[PDB]
Each structure stands twice: as structure tokens, then as C-alpha cells.
Write an enzyme that holds these catalytic residues in place. Sequence first.
Site, PDB file in Angstrom:
ATOM      1  N   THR B   1     -17.720  41.210 -35.323  1.00 32.36           N
ATOM      2  CA  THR B   1     -16.904  40.318 -34.445  1.00 32.36           C
ATOM      3  C   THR B   1     -17.205  38.858 -34.749  1.00 32.36           C
ATOM      4  OG1 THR B   1     -16.740  41.910 -32.608  1.00 32.36           O
ATOM      5  CG2 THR B   1     -16.440  39.565 -32.064  1.00 32.36           C
ATOM      6  N   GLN B   2     -16.156  38.046 -34.803  1.00 35.19           N
ATOM      7  CA  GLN B   2     -16.308  36.620 -35.052  1.00 35.19           C
ATOM      8  C   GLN B   2     -15.274  35.834 -34.264  1.00 35.19           C
ATOM      9  OE1 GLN B   2     -14.242  38.542 -36.842  1.00 35.19           O
ATOM     10  NE2 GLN B   2     -14.448  38.057 -39.025  1.00 35.19           N
ATOM     11  N   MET B 107     -15.420  46.883 -36.474  1.00 31.82           N
ATOM     12  CA  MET B 107     -15.576  45.775 -35.527  1.00 31.82           C
ATOM     13  C   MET B 107     -15.949  44.459 -36.220  1.00 31.82           C
ATOM     14  SD  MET B 107     -14.655  47.013 -32.660  1.00 31.82           S
ATOM     15  CE  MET B 107     -15.265  45.863 -31.437  1.00 31.82           C
TER      16      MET B 107
ATOM     17  N   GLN G   1     -14.157  37.219 -27.560  1.00 39.68           N
ATOM     18  CA  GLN G   1     -14.612  38.548 -28.069  1.00 39.68           C
ATOM     19  C   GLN G   1     -13.445  39.301 -28.704  1.00 39.68           C
ATOM     20  OE1 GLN G   1     -17.760  39.807 -28.246  1.00 39.68           O
ATOM     21  NE2 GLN G   1     -16.944  41.656 -29.234  1.00 39.68           N
ATOM     22  N   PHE G   2     -13.747  40.080 -29.740  1.00 45.53           N
ATOM     23  CA  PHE G   2     -12.731  40.830 -30.470  1.00 45.53           C
ATOM     24  C   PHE G   2     -12.374  42.125 -29.745  1.00 45.53           C
ATOM     25  CE2 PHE G   2     -11.873  44.127 -33.784  1.00 45.53           C
ATOM     26  CZ  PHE G   2     -10.591  43.706 -34.094  1.00 45.53           C
TER      27      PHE G   2
END
Lengths: 195, 233, 204, 211, 240, 235, 222, 244, 231
Positions: B1-2, B107, G1-2
Site C-alpha cells: 500500500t502506498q 496489496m 489507505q488502499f
Amino acid sequence: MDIILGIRVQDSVILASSKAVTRGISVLKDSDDKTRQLSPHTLMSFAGEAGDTVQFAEYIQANIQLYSIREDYELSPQAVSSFVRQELAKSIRSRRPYQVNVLIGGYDKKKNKPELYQIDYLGTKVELPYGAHGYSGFYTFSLLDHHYRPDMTTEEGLDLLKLCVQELEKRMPMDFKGVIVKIVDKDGIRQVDDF
Amino acid sequence: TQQPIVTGTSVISMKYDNGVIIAADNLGSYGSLLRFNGVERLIPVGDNTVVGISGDISDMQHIERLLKDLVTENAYDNPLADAEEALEPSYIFEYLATVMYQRRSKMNPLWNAIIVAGVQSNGDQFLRYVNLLGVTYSSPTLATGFGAHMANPLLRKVVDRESDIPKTTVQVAEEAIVNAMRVLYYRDARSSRNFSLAIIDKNTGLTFKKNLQVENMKWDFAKDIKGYGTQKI
Amino acid sequence: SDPSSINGGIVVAMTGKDCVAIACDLRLGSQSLGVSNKFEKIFHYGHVFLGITGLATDVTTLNEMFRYKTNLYKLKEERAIEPETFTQLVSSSLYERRFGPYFVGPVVAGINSKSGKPFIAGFDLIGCIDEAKDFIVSGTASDQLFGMCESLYEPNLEPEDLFETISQALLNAADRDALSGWGAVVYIIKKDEVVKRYLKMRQD
Amino acid sequence: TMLAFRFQGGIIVAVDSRATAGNWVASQTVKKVIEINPFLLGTMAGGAADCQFWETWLGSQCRLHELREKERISVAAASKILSNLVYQYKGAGLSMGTMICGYTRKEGPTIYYVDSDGTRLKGDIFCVGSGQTFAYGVLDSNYKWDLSVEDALYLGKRSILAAAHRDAYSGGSVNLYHVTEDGWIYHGNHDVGELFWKVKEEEGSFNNVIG
Amino acid sequence: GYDRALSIFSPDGHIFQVEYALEAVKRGTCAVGVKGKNCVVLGCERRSTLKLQDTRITPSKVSKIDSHVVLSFSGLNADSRILIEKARVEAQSHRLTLEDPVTVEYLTRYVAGVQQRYTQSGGVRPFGVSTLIAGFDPRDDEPKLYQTEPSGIYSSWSAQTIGRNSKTVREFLEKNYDRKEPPATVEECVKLTVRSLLEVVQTGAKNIEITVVKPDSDIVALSSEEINQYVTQIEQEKQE
Amino acid sequence: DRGVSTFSPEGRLFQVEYSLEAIKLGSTAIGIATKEGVVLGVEKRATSPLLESDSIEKIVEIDRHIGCAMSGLTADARSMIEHARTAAVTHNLYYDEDINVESLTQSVCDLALRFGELMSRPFGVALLIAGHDADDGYQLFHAEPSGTFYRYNAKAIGSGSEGAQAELLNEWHSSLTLKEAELLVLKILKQVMEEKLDENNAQLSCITKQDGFKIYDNEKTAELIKELKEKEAAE
Amino acid sequence: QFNPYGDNGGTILGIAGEDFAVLAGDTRNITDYSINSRYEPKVFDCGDNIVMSANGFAADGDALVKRFKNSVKWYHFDHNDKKLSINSAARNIQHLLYGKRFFPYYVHTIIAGLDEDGKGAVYSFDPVGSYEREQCRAGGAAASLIMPFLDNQVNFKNQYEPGTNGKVKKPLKYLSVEEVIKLVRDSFTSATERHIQVGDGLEILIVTKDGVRKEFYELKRD
Amino acid sequence: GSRRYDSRTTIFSPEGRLYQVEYALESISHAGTAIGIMASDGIVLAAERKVTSTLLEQDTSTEKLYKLNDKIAVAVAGLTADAEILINTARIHAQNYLKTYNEDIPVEILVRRLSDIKQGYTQHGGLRPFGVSFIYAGYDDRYGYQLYTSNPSGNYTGWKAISVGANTSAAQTLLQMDYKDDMKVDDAIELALKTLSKTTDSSALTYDRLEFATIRKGANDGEVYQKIFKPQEIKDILVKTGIT
Amino acid sequence: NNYDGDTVTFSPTGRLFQVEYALEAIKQGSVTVGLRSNTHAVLVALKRNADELSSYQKKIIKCDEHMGLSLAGLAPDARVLSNYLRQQCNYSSLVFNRKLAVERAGHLLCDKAQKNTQSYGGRPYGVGLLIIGYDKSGAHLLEFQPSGNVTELYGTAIGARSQGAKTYLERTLDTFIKIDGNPDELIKAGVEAISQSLRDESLTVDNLSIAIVGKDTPFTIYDGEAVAKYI
Ligand SMILES: [Mg+2]
Ligand SMILES: [Mg+2]
């Protein structure tokens, strides 16, 4: 709160454990035996998180029974308690720790002495004349501080235990559906069928 | 995740009778700062495909390299690399779409929105979208970001359904694309006046136009606007 | 929640003239509930003494661990371990668990068998050595012990005087802490004799 | 809602048929009883997929047992395979309530309650699910050891009906089973839309309702 | 890791390493198993080349796997400990998961499976051990007696012997053991087991070990004097 | 010495060819496939009279619709059977159906050549895998340690194989009944066996669509042996 | 957040006949309040006379369908070109879904075809693999609008025979393919009116012993 | 490849013997003799150092007798380096048992563990076995005083009196002759030294060529003491018994 | 001699004997023929039986809708290599939405077989394969040898007595290449080609095995009464 008590008298150890199994809002069972025989002269009662309790007890039971066969010899209660403590002390820093508290009542045939060990889920071991886990101790410890002697008989120990259970039945909010009582002495382990 | 840092805005495209058109501005934004003003976000693959990318520019440059490496690898032990076994738009797209969905499933996504525009071996038009989630879809008009909200409505007035494609010429389609880019410059706060446009025709091939500008803008009416309500002066 | 103050307890150590003293309370509890009044926190490996406060399971675990290590040391070296060396062994052992530490506050006490020099030391939970000349304190009533020791202590005390000073430091500090008390033990250590005394204190 | 109780003539097993996703009634026709083998039954409560998947997996493990050992698995060993499995997944998020009911020669009729928390309990009576309390109310007050196979079947059916009525997340229909020395016996699907009114008229109960 | 294939086929279709493991069993002290109507007896030879031994602490030849099953062996002594340990662990593991002690057939099948695995695994040699596994299944009064060998094959026996001079004692058992009417009592079964060993043993002093296993976890090892009484009675009847 | 996966100058794997010699030393096993079912029969061959012959398990159930007989180093077969049983049950779990006999046989044969320097040597046992499915009906397969499997109308493996196979060559036809096949297995077993054939030193089994795989009782086989003797004496 | 999941809208519908089965779905694809495509196929011919749709998060739906098609391919390779029965396909799909129990395919899956007796079959799945054979099932965004209609008009629920007054039910007469397609079209026309994610087009796949046939119908584009 | 150079240490001979174990025992038969004698009130351990030198520092030297814990000791016969590997493992095992059960390890359990390690080197791993034979002398509260021996095969047995290393055949005959069950430690000390004095390959038995140890309950009240004899103490016991 | 113990050892003349011995296993195998025109590609295989009670060992394996092969030698090794091709064909479809080129399929087989000839412990594959297929550049026929050598051909044959069929195809080269848009005649030429390798035995209904792939023809296998037409 899964009431488990223990009292060490002159010539025996007496363990009392509640019969209720409550899952949520319902009492699923009122005759549950919260104990396992580790060896002929060693008994372990237990209480904690659902599933973990039995899984842990049976795992310990299997290990002690394996030792007994291998050496053709019964481990002392002190030795069994130390083994159990190490397993819990190992467990507390695991990915998912065993959430189980235990009492170990045994009769040492070498020293001809009864022995009671209290061990919590962190691996905190103490030898005691009488012990309890959870909220039971908040009522029973002070009561036993008043009525206990080291030279008591098994019958006096049972009367003393009835006094503990009566107090718990009066002041604790859960109906724990009475207790199963077991005596550990030189002749082995037996259950008091009327209590 | 970024989180995305240096970003590219809308990429717009549409089908016409003999091919596909795709366009995108030359800006690399750093939040509210319009930092890089010479960024090419349309990347040709062979002479039959153009990949238009929006979103994170660092991930765009990574994808640009994958495609460059894809061409190199397809040529290996392939005597028909410039003919029958050349890379197709459908091959290039499915590759990217595979990567995008794999990365989202770990992710650790490539924070982009991609449109692969091209013409197949049989002359069929190819236009398909894929994004950081691995989500794919095709349509006569496709647009990313703000273009989805403002360009698609304009381009769908030209090609509202599949049957309108043969009726649409390249001059009409290019006119619509260029108009849409002007509208985005009016209304998208992360857009630039300068942009690149590419046409992939089944007859005339790949025409890549650089250094285009939005022109014929309407601003004169601004002089008459005074205050926010009651202000006469 | 705070592991170092669930069970409760204290340890204190003092130097004297050709002697050292180390003392501890006997309580073990589960927060407010007192469980055991026979939980000793001082152990010895040969002539080196170690007191441990903090989480009781780690206290027990560390005793068993240092018994293990000192027994092997002796077999290989063919001699008992000295306090200065044992102090470094404790520091080493604790820091190897730097990011998953034992929640303890150890205290080493003893006399070098060769030089005869008295030695005490204390640590934090991850290994830092506090080698003090005067005294070392550890536990839930460490603040109280610091105040008593700093005021009552004077250098070069004789064994029978040092006993009174350390006993009064412990007792009065324990009585101002809810999680300490329930009995106490004091070790007076000389080069070739060690006396252990159980103190009479208030049981509340 | 699902129940299972032991009596003179063996075991009664009764379950409802509803499946929900929030307040949305997703299905009224689901099978919450799994026929593991001719002498073993499994009940399902909680996660639909978790229950289905692992109880059909259980049947595969019970079949492998009788291939290797040339003997039918016991209820104790079958229940313990499932409980040991879910215990491995403890903390991961499985949601299952299961009663492994069956008969063998050496055990007799036996019921084990198995839980995704790792709980494994032997007992004569169990009611599990969001409607367990409603079923317990009827079942407990009318239970006797010496019921007839006919009266017992009805009590289990009636206990589910009670729960289907009051519990919003229970309903659809009642699936009945009876387990004896010679295996299990299906006793039909009973739609609540018809069973309710039938019971009301014949029994004279459910006076809370306008009928 | 050491992956070398030690157990392999030869041109004539033999696995020599498995066959040479049987030669190690042939060298081992004699062991015999006889099952009666309501009991099983395990007899074992103790070679009298080793005196000044401490018989209290010396590893006994018959080993309890569980309270209801026993295991004796012939061959390499060190190898037998590994099989016995594995068997004991599996016995407790079975009780833990199945909530019932192992059958004698199951325990035999496990030990035999271990022995087999060591005949086609890289970097290991076969066990130089054959075992006799005897006992009674839980809640069952039918006697059980099984044999295993290095190859991994196992089978049930009315009576069987293994080890050195096992050919002779098997000859004795084949003519003396009647299937239609096996040793009805413990005495008759022990007597037949001692008789069979007396064909091979040499002296009937401390060279014979006897272990009687009865139903419901009733296992006992006979003492020197108890066995010596059987030895005395057998020879006194023989003088005729 | 030399590699375990070495080729001979003739183009054969030494170890595979040597394992085939071990199978020739094994006890006889015969299989016959008919339109009414498949019959499997074996020679038990007890090494001593004290050995309880009923414990000799050379015919084995894999699933309800698949059976298996073995010949050679029979200890090696246990892991093959375990794999077969797991493959059969696993497929039922994944696909809610019975597994094809050929697919089961193929799964077993995939283990065969997994040896090198995986297991240290090939299997020293051959298998006759018999079963039934809806697609290809009653089938009989011969699974070798080479990884190869042939389907057969009838097949004999073990010490008396080439003599038995020649006899099966003449006797088999496409219209054989199940009863005729049972007697035929007993007939050929009796011919190639050293000791005299009876219900204790020989075992029969069959697989039918209705009843599935069944190992025959010694009382049931004894009657078929008596029925055989009479019909041979009849001419 | 993803956020690795999305919602592409759409709605699907499966109905089983006596000797046929249909699997319908709208052709609209959306994110939030925008339209991605007015024609993006959602129901697929997977081989062996099986049709499939995985509605919800399109990326997960495409992946699942892609994997099942692959499963069918390898079923042929491994089992001598045997035809994959609808019941066997359903069980295979359960394992595909539950294999990602702890990172789910965010879809409602439906398959349709014919059982081994030639009768029409519809199977319905939840996101983590629980499945059930049904005569009727709608899935997706407008499933809550459509299913009650199907309970009423397919299984004749709450319907009785006039004159008896609630005593005798409506008999469960079977439905023809022509009668079913009417219910499908009306279902989607009604759903398009009241659900914003439904519209543009309707594509129906009909399955018979003769094979797989397609029918397309326009829907409102607002 | 590498197969060409593999000795194959873990295989059977045609006769059913383990080549490397048999050859390891041949190695041990040339090692200095070690004797163990068990009495009613204690155990004796005696051992002969191999052809020493006058310039060897004896008082700080240790090649034969090693301490495993306070209750158990071992006499070594074979490769010293190999023995030290096993000794350190045995020391750890004893401490593991003590940590787990809070009781000193029973002698047999320790012996079995070491013997199982030796066994492993004969069955798997392709490595050479340890060329070592031990005499274990120990005490516990179950069986009391115990003597064991283990060899490279991993097989172990219990003894009243036993010898390992060189001239065991001659040594065992002498022990079998003079040993009695009611014997005491002081008598056993004399027997051990007399046996070495006759079986030795040296011209005369002297203090500088010996290592000696006793395990006695001769400790103040119910407890056990290990005494590793010093050079001067070995010299005194040699004069006392009348050998020098 | 001394240099044939393993695959990792060259001989003094630079030969790899284990590879040559693996090549020998192919020559022992039953004959199989491959040939193609511009529109179609055909495989013809003579199946072998153990005896009269046994079935005839299958020789042809399908890899994809547009590709497949016939085997000669160790059948289990063909199963391993065909499984690998199936996966590679499948990877090309799933990832690139692209049918795998027959030439590239040959390159992948070559490289897989090669690794087994240069490393210690393993062994060469003991089977020869004839791969046919129809891709974007038309019909193709490949010959795989377990040495690693793969060759694209108009026609060929491998196995026992394969030299007879190979000579026939060498004469017929100009004729059968021109057989476009006529599958039956191309198979006839293949059946006539494999007939040149027969001795004693002839082509029966359960003996013959044929497979074909082409422009509008998926890879299909014909066995049993389906090949009676061509006998
Ligand atoms: Mg505690
Ligand atoms: Mg709409």
C-alpha cells in the site's frame, strides 16, 4: 467465571471445579468435568478461554502419559508442575498464547505428602495450602485464611470446601451449577459423587 | 500500500470508422503544484498500439519499461516479429491487466489508470481500460479521472453506441477529442494547456502528434462579471 | 496492563565493610488480590546472589535460565562464577531479547572470592548496568526505596549494623506501597558465611 | 435454529431452513443437516460456507477412516477431527456451530457440540443458533427421557417452529431426522407457512397471533 | 543433506541392504511369541556371555508401547529403541485424536510403515530389527500377536519366533502348537513358551525372560524363581 | 557406483528393469474383466502354517467402485494404496462424483518414476487395479513401476504369470459371466500354485456396479472351489 | 489507505425450466455515479453446456470466471474429455471461492445449465463458496427488487385459488422458455426504473440440450 | 559427480554388521584402559593415560575423566576430541532436564540420550561415527548407584563392574574373579588399581600415568560428592594399596 | 564405456552416451508419422499392445485446441513433457490472450530437455515427440529429440522402422504439401506413409491412431471405428 478451587490438607489434595458451560446467553451444559488425570497420583483442573482449556489439558496429559510409559515411572507433582509452567511460559510469547489457568493437585509417593500448585496463563507458579483462579479467590481466600489448618482431615477439608461453595453460591452473580469434587491421596484419585 | 506522489491527470480516447484516437496532457503534478511540464504520458508499442497512462508517474515509468522489455522479448527467436507474430493491442493489454490485478492482490498496486488503444491484425479497433484494482472494461469512448466525468459525455454525443462508429470520421473524432481537452483545461485544476495526441488508423498507421496546445478559448465574457452578487462596480 | 506492576514486589541491595546485603519482600499478587506470601525473589548461584523484581513468570524463568548458564560455566571453567562476570552475563542475556524483553528489574550482589571486594549492581529490563558503590533498588516501591536508602545509608557499615539499615529501608518503603510487603527476607553476606533472616512486618 | 436431543428411542435432530445477509432473507430452502454417512449427521449454524465446506470435508475424512481401519468412525473421533481442524484456524475468523449426531455399537447414540472457538462438548440436549433460546424454552419444558419416537419427533419439530416464529433470522421450513441403532431416518420437510396454522388449530397454542 | 540411495535393486531383483538387515536379525538373540485362548506370552533369550551385568538397570528385551500392548525384538538393540520411541509417541497421539487406544494391528501397521519408509528413503539404511508385537484390543478378549521385519511386511501369527536359531524353535512350535485347541490357561501357554526356548537357550537360569500379557491392560513380567520352576518341571517330565 | 536414474545402452532404466525382476518373485495375482463385473484373485502364500492366513491382505479396497490386487514387495504397495484412496476421496470432494478408474490409475502411476538422488528407488510391486465407472464401464488396469499402465480384458502378474497369461489367452471371451470368471480365476490359480489350492491359501474378490467392491468370505470361496472340482470331473 | 475492492454494479438473474435454463444479466458497468461501459458482457459460456456469471466487483468476477473456464479445460485433459456435470462444476466453484476465504472474491456467482437427467438447473453461490441448487435466483445490485417478484411469479408464493379463500394453493405449473423470458425482461425493466446501476442493455443466455443461445434487448440509458 | 568419492559410512556388510562401527571399536581397543566398579556405598572410576611425557603438565590435564553434572561423571576411551563434542551435548541435556522438571536428570535417561545420538550416526547422515566408548558413573534417588557403558553403535548396558579400551578381555576376567556384591568403595578402589596394574602395557603403574575419581555418599549426610583425584592424591592411594 | 555412468560426462570423442542411450529408447518405440500441407497438419501413430487381452497404448496427446503431439519411447516422459506444453500454451492464453506459436513451443521443449543433460543426478528424457499445430503463420510440424534438438519439417517419422515412412515422404514431398482444403486426402497420404514401416502386422481398427489440426479444425484425435474409413 469458571470457578476452580483447591485445598491441600494433612494427607490429601481436594480439587473443586464448576459444572456449568455457558456460551453467551445460554448454559449449554451443567455437568462438565473441568479436569484431567495426568498420572495415577496427579490431577489437573483448568479454566480459561473456550477450546484452549481442553486442548491444553489433553496436550499436557498426553505428554505426561508418554513420560510414564517411556520410563515406567510416575513423575513427582513438583516435576509435572514445572513442566506445565514451562509450557505456559513458552506459550505467553507465542503467536497465539494458551489462555488457560490451572491447578495441579498431586500426592508425592516418595515424600508421602500432598501438594497443590497454582499456575496462571503467564506461567506463574506457586505452591499453596489452598488456591483458586479467577474471581473465586476474591471470596474464598479470606474465608480459608480464617478456617484452614495444616493438620486437617479429608472430611474436615470437604466441610471447609462446602463452606466456600455456599459463599460463592450466595454472593457471585453467575449460576455455576455446583461443583465436581475430586480427592487426590496415597490411594490415587477418586470422585465425591454426592456434593 | 502506498500513496501517489507525482501524478498524471485524464487520458481520453474514442473509436472512429477506421481506428482509434487517444490523447493526454503533458503535465506531472506534485499535489497542487504543477511541477513537471514536459511529461509524455502516451507510450507507443510498435506501430499499432498506444498505451495512455494516468496516475502515479513513477509507476508509469515502470510500466513504460515493462512494455519496452516486452517488445525486446517478443523479438527473441521470432523471425515474424515485424509481421504475423508481432505484438497486438490485445496481447499488450492482457499482460498489463494481469500485472495490475496481481499487484492489487498483493496489496501493493500500481497506482494508475490505463487505456490501451490500437488496431488489431484483422483491422478491428481495440480500446480497453484497466486500473490499479485490475478492473477492466471496454467502450466506444473511454476516459480516466476527470475525463470520465467531462469528456465521455461529449464523446458519447458523437459515438453513443457501437453502430455510430462506422459513421464517424477521423476529422470529426479528432475535433471532438481536441474540444474535450479544452474543456478539461477550463475545469480540471490539475491539467495543462500542452498535450499529446495519437491516431492509430488501419490504413495510414500510427500518427503521433506532440506539442499540441488548447486554442480558441473563450474568456472575453469575464470582463462583464463583477463581484459575487450585489456589486455594480 | 503494565507487566512490571501486576505481581508487585521489591528488592534492595547494600554494601558494607567487607560485606554486602540483599533483601526482598515476599508478596505475589494479581493486582489487588494477594495470592502468595512465600514468593522469594532472591536466588543464588554459588556465592553470587541475584534478586529479581517484576513479572513473576519472568522472575522464575530467569532464575532457571541463570542456574542453567552458571552450572555450565562452572563445569567448563572449573570454578564458580564471580559477581562482576555474572553481571555481564545478565546484561548480555537481557539485551538478546531487546525487542521482546523480560519485564524484570534484576539486582546482583556478592563478594569477589579472590579480591574480597564487595560488589552490587542493578539493571533495567533490557540490560543497562547500574554499578553503584552504595546501594541498588528495584521494584514497585523503587521511589520509596531510593528515598530511604539515600537518607539512611552511610558507607563502611558493619554486618550487624548494615542489617538494621537495609531492613528499615525495605520495611518502611514497602509500607507505602500497596503491591509490596506480606513478609520480607534479608541476606547478610560475608566472604565465607551467609545469614538469612525473615523479618516481622505488618501483613496488609 | 437447530436442535438435537437424546431419548429412549435414539436421537432427534431438527433444524430450520432460513439463511440471511443482514435483514435480507437470502434463502428459505437451505439444508442445515449433512448426511455424513448412514449413521452420522452434522448440523450447521453460523457461517454458511464455513459450515458447508468443512462438514463435507469432514465426511471425506470419515470415509478415509473406514477405508484404512475397515470400520465406521465413532462420533467421538469424527467430532474431534472437526474440532481439531477449526482450532488450527482459531483467530482467523471462522464462524461455525455444529452438532455431530450419530450411533455406534460401543458408544450408543451420541451427540457432540462442536464450535469454531474450539469447544467440544458431549451431551444429551443441544440447541444452537440465533434461535437456540426459543427452542430451549419449548424443548426443556416438555422434555422427558421416555418419549415415544412419535412424541419426540413432534417436540423437536415444535421447538423449531417456536423459534422460527419468534426469531427473525430463523424460519422457512423444518427438516426432521431420527437416529436409531440402524442409522438415520429422514422425516420430511415441513413448511412453516402451513405447519404454523396446523399446529395452532390442533394444539390450541399461539394465542398471541390473530388467526 | 545426505541424499544417497543406499537401498537399491540389483540385477536379480533383490534389495541387498534390506536382505543384509535380515542377517542382523539372524544374529540377534532369540525371541518367541505364543498366544493362548485368553493370553499371549512373549519369551526372550538372554545370552550368558555377559555376566557381571546389572539386571535391575539393563534395558529389558520386552518393552511396553502402551498399557495394553508390548513389543519385543531381535536384531540391533540401538535400532530397536528408535522404533519403540516412535511407536510410543504414535500410541499417545492416537489416544489424543481418536479418544481410544490403538489396536494391536494398527500399532503394528505403523511400526511396519516406518520400517518400510527406511527402505526407499535417501541417505538412510534399513532397520536391522524384526519385532513381535502382542496385546489385546480395547474392550476385547481375543489375543493378538503380530510380526514385522526390515522390509516392512507384517502379519498375524498363532505362534512365532525370530532371531538366532529361530528355525529350530519354529520347528518345535509347528509340531507342538495345535490351532483347534491352543493353550487354555496361562500356565499351559508359559510352559509351551519356555519349552520352545529350552530347545535353543543352553541353561535355564537367567537366560530366559518371560512376559505374560492378559486382557484389560494386565501385563506382568515373571521373575527368575518363577521361571526356574517351569524349567524344573519340564526336565523332570522329560526324564521318562 | 552408478546413478539410480541411469539408462542402459539398450535404452532402459536399470532400476526399473531390476524392480520388474522382484515382481516376478512375488505371489500370483489374476484379474478378469467381464460385462457383469471384474474379478480379482490372489495367491496368499503363507511362509509357515502358524501364520494366520486371514491377516494376509493382498487384495485391497481403494473406493466403493475400485479394488486393487498386488504382487511383489507388498510392503511398497501401502503408500501407493494410501495415495490411491486419498486421490479417490479428494476427487469426490472437489467434484461431487466418483473418479474414473483410468484417472485413478494414472494418479498412482505418476508416483512410479518419482525416484532419484523424492524416494530413493522405484516401487518393487505391480498392481492390478479393477473398477467400474459410468463412462467406460467395467475395467482392469495393470500398473507397473515404470509408470506405464495397460488396460486388460484379463491379466496375470507374479511368479506364474506367463503360464497363467497363456491360459487366459485361450479361455477369455467377450460373453463371460461373473460366475464363469470366478471359476476361471480359481482354475488358473490352482494350476500355477505350488501348494494345493483351498479357501485359506487363496482369496477371491469382485467389483460390480450394484454392490461395489467386495472381498469374498472363505465360506463363499470354498463353495466355488467345490463347484470347480465337480465341473472338471464332469468331463 | 488502499482499498482493494470496488463495486461495478450490475444485476443478474437465473431461472431453471423443465428442460432448459436461462442466465440473464444487464450489460452496464459503473463506478460510483459514472458509467464505464453501456455494453460489457457479464454472462459467459464456459463450455460443457454451462453458463456462468460472477456479479459485484468485476475484477474478481473476471478472475473467477477465467479460473473456472481453466478448470473445465483441465478437467478434460485429466479425465479423458469427460463432460463436466453442473453439480460437479458447482462443487469445483465452491473450492475456488473458499480457497480465498480470507481474501474473498467479492462477487455473487450464479451458474446455469442442465443436470444429468436433462432437467434445467440453477446454482447460486455466496462470496465464500456456500452453494445451493435453486429453481430461481437473482443476484447483484437489484436482487432485492427482483427476487420477491420471482417468488410470486415463478413459485406462486402467497397465491391461492379463488373461491376457496386461502385453503387451496395455486398449483405449481411449469413455465415455458417464452414465459420465462417475459418474466426476465419485465424483471430487468422494473429494476432499471428503480435502480440507478441497472440499465443500458440486457443479454440473456439460454441453455438447452441443443446448446447455448443468446438474446439481447435494449434497456433505458438514463 | 560426488557419488564416486562416497565411502558410504552407514551400510550393512553381507554378514549384517556395520563396517564403520566395527572399525571404530577396533580404534577404541588401542585406547587407554578405563575401569568402572560399583559398590554398595559408592562408585569408582579409574583410567590410564596413554604413554605420557615428563614435560606434560598433569595437574591441569584432563583426557579421561569428565564431569557431566554434580551427580554423574564419565570415563572416556577413544578419540578425546570426539568425546568432548558428546560431553558438551550431554551437559546441555542434563541442564535442559533440570530446567524443565526442576529435578536432576536420572542417570539412564542421560545415557539413553547420548546413546541415541551415536545410533543416529550409524543409520543416517553419511558421516563417520564417534570413535568413543563411555563408562557412565552416576547416582539418582530411583536406582541409586549405577554404572553404564555406551559404544559407537549406540548400544548401552548396565554393569556392576566393567572395563573399556585396551585389554578389556584380560581386565574383565580379573574383575569377574575378585568382585563381590557386598563390596565397599575402599575395596573397589583397591580392585580397580590392581586390575590396571596387571593389564597395563607399561612397565610399572605410576601416579603420573593415571586419572582417578570416586562418587561417594561419603558426604556430610544424605547427599552425593564427586571427587576427581589430584596427582598427589593418586600418589597417596597408590602407596596405601601397596602398588608403589 | 567408462564415460556412460551419468549425463554429466563427455567421452574422449565429445559424445554424451546417456543422451545416446535415451535416443535408443525411441528406436525401440512403435512407429509414428507426421506430415502437413499449407492448410492442415496430420499425425498418424501405430499403437502397440502388450498381448491380445491388453489394450493398445495411446500414442497421441492433445496440448491445446490448436496444438498436440505424438510420442515414441517412454510414455511417462511424454506425459511430463506434454503436461509442460499444456501449461505453457495455457500461460500464453491467460496472460497474453495469445495462442502459443508452434516454433516457440519447440524452443521451450528444447530448453527443458537440455537442463536434464548438463546436470548431475537427473537423467535425459527417454522419448521422442512429433508436434503438430496451426498458429498465425499457418500449419507446422516439429520433431523433438531428448538431446534437446528440435526441428521444423514438412514431414517426418520416428520409432522402429521409421526410415521406410521417412523415405516415402521424401519422394511424396511435392504432392502432399499441395493437399490444401482436403483433410481426408492428407490423412490418406499419412496412412500410406506409415504403411511403409509395417512388417507382418497390418493396420486394424484398434491398432491405428490418427490426429489432425488445421485452419478451421481444432486438434482432434480419431480412434476405433472413426479410423475404419482410412483402413
Ligand atoms: Mg497465579
Ligand atoms: Mg437505470
